[PDB]
């Protein structure tokens, strides 16, 4: 039994209704759940039996169901609903989940307020180096970081971590945090992060001992 | 011909948990003693535990008693050693042998149990607040968990009652080996001088808990 | 309240072995159907197993199909997976969940099973005999066999009929992460023009097996 | 129960006997064993009962008891019988074994047949040249292998693996690969493999070409 689920991700802004389908490729009953995921976190149950609601759940959340064809209905897109959406057929003894929806949120383009760091002064006297960089409540996700080290372009000696999508503002936050040892940061005096979004660029800079 | 057979054997992090099988073949489990016995790379061997024939009486050494446990399956010909609470000196290569005449005869081949990459804990660094660095009222505090496996680590601030505006990164796996991730919060520019910030980092794997009070930095 | 605890999970090579267990909290597992989810790195989730409450009917996936094994202990109120043959698609995070209402109410944490860097056979090169490179009499000729994972390898020369003089050294790991290991053989200098030798390597992780016929090098 | 092995390791030639003893910490009955152990091997049981020699042991192995002094006795040391030798208690139901004693079978000191084999030309297409240098039947173990390019000492590009012991003829064998990428292979002409042993030193090489 092949649960064909559509679509495969989604982008839907605050308000807007959601209709993700669930086509069953054999009629096996009604015995079709839904389930909530968010990244690292086990699947949450949403609706059971395919039209009623498990204990707890916001009402936004619906199930239907037209002979082979199972719905799930967000009314009310609340930016806490981000998450990876599946459908599940327990008939036949021979659960059967779909291949899943990831729900993102849509939101006005906001450009992200950058922050630097110069390393601190303890992690200095072992050796090592962290200058981070910090894009602070940003959109949509896409950005370019740059590191530059005396206008000399770094390369291949910093990572960068992103946040899940913020539950309230929808928004992104990156950093990127360049690591060097205590000589090579001692050798220089300007740290710059310059951070591309579409048409704009922001570099934020210090100068060692200012 | 009598033959032993041993699997169930790999890597495990320190604690976790396996099940080594000594799958026997040309006499039956249930009529003899079994036993099980351990020798770390480039050490000698060591006895972790024994079984009974039919009272299933096991018995074990300080070593592993309480971590490890004995078993074994006559409808299979196949005894057992469930391992749990994993550690450094854990890492041997594992036989099972029969024993007989007051001695172990027969002998498997072995399995490698091998514990994994010694728990780190994390190192924090204050992502130091600033003026020139801040917009004129949002202000950027954070802490920098560096150097540490393995995971989770658990970031709150001010004991869990700040929580607007912070945003705790995922871990990046530096090339070390080690994990290291940062934790960050706007607040108030003015909020900066009055309002005392902690993050408080928590490694249960390493039963460490840090709290380092974020401070304005030195000219 | 109703917990559901997994651990067990760890890293294997291809085939191994290894058992999981859903320690059940709040409830009696015996009287749930108890479900093996499990989901890979990026990829959606995966039934693997189910388990019926009393009559302890075991229910699986062709996917693991005689090579998982799902079991339950109502005396610890524990679920079990014994995994067995394991391959690179069973890298994934493992979960157990409790049925009800024709779905799966509660959920674990989920445990993380990784397969082994991938098998790979040896690649075998001649170590060509000479003349000047070589005594009066005395004369050496191998076999080189480098870029093979995982152990072992067995290297056999002319069928096994050629065993006075023969050397096979221990593998050493290269910093590829790959074996590699050479076997030696020292002939008479006069038999270098009509005795032929056939170096028999044997890689049965890869069920793969090499026959070089080393021979004079060339000008 | 502490049973403790003596001595930790001997070096005794062919003919010669031996006398390993375990001295029990406690009087605990004479359910003393004794095994042999090579490399990669499983124990190999010699004998139980701390004198009854288990079936299939060459008569030149015997065990004895003085009180808490268990010994086991090799009469005429057999160039196969170098291995790690075992005393082990199996009295109070608490198994418990010796330490260990590693026997090593000396032998007239022997200088190797070095052998230098350039690279396959199979390999060389592959990109990676791997140059060996073999030191074939010498005693003892120790010795120093060092490569040189065109004179040039290398230095961080070696791998080197010895054998055990010969059951025959108690000498080693070792092989030193050097590997390098194909352009640095083609780029150099003389390759020389230098074994240092004592007071004598020996240099084989090959011009690449000839």
């Known amino acids: 039994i092949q649960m064909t689920q559509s679509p495969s991700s989604l982008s839907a802004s605050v308000g807007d209704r959601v209709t993700i389908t669930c086509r069953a490729s054999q009629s096996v009953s009604s015995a079709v759940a839904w389930y909530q995921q968010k990244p690292g976190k086990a699947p949450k149950l949403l609706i059971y039996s395919a039209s009623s609601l498990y204990s707890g759940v916001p009402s936004r959340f619906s199930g239907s169901r037209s002979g082979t064809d199972f719905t799930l209905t967000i009314s009310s897109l609340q930016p806490e609903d981000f998450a990876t959406y599946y459908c599940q057929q327990s008939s036949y003894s021979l659960i059967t989940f779909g291949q899943g929806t990831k729900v993102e949120i849509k939101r006005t383009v906001a450009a992200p307020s950058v922050f630097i760091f110069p390393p601190s002064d303890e992690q200095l006297k072992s050796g090592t180096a962290s200058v981070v960089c910090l894009l602070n409540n940003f959109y949509p996700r896409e950005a370019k970081v740059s590191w530059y080290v005396d206008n000399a372009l770094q390369s291949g000696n910093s990572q960068e971590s992103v946040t899940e999508q913020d539950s309230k503002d929808s928004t992104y936050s990156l950093s990127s945090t360049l690591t060097l040892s205590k000589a090579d940061y001692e050798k220089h005096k300007v740290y710059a992060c310059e951070v591309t979004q579409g048409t704009t660029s922001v570099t934020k800079s210090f100068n060692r001992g200012e | 011909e009598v033959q032993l057979v041993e699997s169930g054997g790999g890597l495990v992090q320190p604690g976790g948990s396996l099940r080594l099988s000594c799958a026997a073949s040309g006499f039956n489990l249930r009529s003899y003693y079994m036993h099980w016995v351990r020798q770390a790379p480039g050490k000698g061997l060591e006895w972790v535990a024994s079984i009974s024939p039919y009272y299933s009486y096991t018995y074990y050494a300080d070593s592993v008693k309480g971590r490890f446990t004995i078993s074994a399956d006559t409808s299979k010909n196949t005894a057992y050693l469930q391992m749990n609470s994993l550690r450094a000196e854990d890492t041997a290569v594992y036989y099972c042998?029969?024993?007989?005449?007051?001695?172990?005869?027969?002998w498997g081949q072995g399995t490698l149990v091998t514990v994994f990459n010694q728990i780190k804990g994390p190192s924090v660094f204050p992502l130091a607040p600033s003026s020139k660095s801040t917009s004129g009222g949002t202000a950027a505090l954070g802490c920098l968990v560096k150097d540490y496996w393995p995971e989770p680590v658990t970031v709150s601030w001010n004991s869990g009652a700040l929580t607007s505006g912070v945003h705790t990164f995922p871990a990046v796996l530096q090339s070390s080996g080690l994990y290291s991730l940062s934790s960050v919060v706007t607040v108030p520019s003015s909020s900066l001088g009055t309002q005392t910030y902690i993050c408080n980092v928590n490694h249960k794997p390493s039963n460490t808990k840090v709290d380092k009070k974020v401070e304005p930095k030195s000219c | 309240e109703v917990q559901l605890v997994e651990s067990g999970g760890g890293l294997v090579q291809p085939g191994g072995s290894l058992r999981l267990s859903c320690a059940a909290s709040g409830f009696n597992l015996r009287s749930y159907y108890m479900h093996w989810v499990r989901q890979a790195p990026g990829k959606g989730l995966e039934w693997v197993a189910s388990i019926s409450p009393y009559y302890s009917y075991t229910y699986y996936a062709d996917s693991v199909k005689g090579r998982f094994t799902i079991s339950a202990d109502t005396s610890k109120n524990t679920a079990y997976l014994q995994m067995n043959s394991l391959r690179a698609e069973d890298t994934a995070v493992?979960?157990?969940?409790?049925?009800?209402?024709?779905?799966?109410?509660?959920?674990?944490?989920g445990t993380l099973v990784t397969v082994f860097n991938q098998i790979k056979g040896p690649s075998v090169f001649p170590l060509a005999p000479s003349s000047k490179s070589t005594s009066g009499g005395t004369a050496a000729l191998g076999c080189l066999v480098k870029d093979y994972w995982p152990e072992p390898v067995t290297v056999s020369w002319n069928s096994g009929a050629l065993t006075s003089g023969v050397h096979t050294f221990p593998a050493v790991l290269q910093s590829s992460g790959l074996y590699s290991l050479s076997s030696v053989v020292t002939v008479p200098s006069s038999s270098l023009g009509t005795q032929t030798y056939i170096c028999n390597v044997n890689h049965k992780p890869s069920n793969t097996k090499v026959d070089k016929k080393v021979e004079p090098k060339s000008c | 129960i502490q049973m403790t092995q003596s001595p930790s390791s001997l070096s005794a030639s062919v003919g010669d006997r031996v006398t390993i003893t375990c001295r029990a910490s406690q009087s605990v009955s004479s359910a003393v064993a004794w095994y042999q152990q090579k490399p990669g091997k499983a124990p190999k049981l010699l004998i139980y009962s701390a004198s009854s020699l288990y079936s299939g042991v060459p008569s030149r192995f015997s065990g004895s008891r003085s009180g808490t002094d268990f010994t086991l006795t090799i009469s005429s040391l057999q160039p196969e019988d170098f291995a790690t030798y075992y005393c082990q208690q199996s009295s109070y139901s608490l198994i418990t074994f010796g330490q260990g004693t590693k026997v090593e079978i000396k032998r007239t000191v022997a200088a190797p047949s070095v052998f230098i084999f350039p690279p396959s030309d199979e390999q060389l297409k592959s990109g990676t040249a791997s140059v060996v240098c073999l030191l074939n039947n010498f005693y003892p173990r120790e010795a120093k292998v060092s490569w040189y390019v065109d004179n040039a000492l290398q230095s961080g590009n070696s791998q080197e693996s010895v054998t055990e012991q010969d059951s025959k003829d108690s000498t080693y064998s070792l092989s030193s690969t050097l590997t390098l990428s194909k352009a640095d292979y083609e780029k150099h002409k003389v390759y020389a493999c230098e074994v240092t042993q004592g007071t004598t030193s020996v240099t084989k090489s090959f011009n690449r070409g000839e």
């Open positions: 042998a029969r024993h007989g005449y007051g001695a172990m005869d027969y």
